[PDB]
């Protein structure tokens, strides 16, 4: 159970980071938009 759960958590965290990267990029463009 634990080995699989951990592998799943590692996969989920990587996909979670991907999401954050995208948002950080969204935030960057929005700020570029606003002029800063």
């Amino acid at each position: 159970r634990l080995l699989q759960r951990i592998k799943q958590q590692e996969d989920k965290l990587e996909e979670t980071l991907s999401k954050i990267y995208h948002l950080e990029n969204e935030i960057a463009r929005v700020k570029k938009l606003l002029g800063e």
Copy 2:
């Protein structure tokens, strides 16, 4: 507890994803506003 630590991490991750979901909505709204 390797067992409790993992359930802890799982719960944490779920809440983190809930936070991200909300932020996705916020930035999308801000983006629509800016045009």
Copy 3:
């Protein structure tokens, strides 16, 4: 493995949460700097 992998995941998630925090702050500044 397992113990060294849960620790690494816990650190990773803490770093991620920090990113989320800064994100929330950035979106709170960008937005309602127009409202």
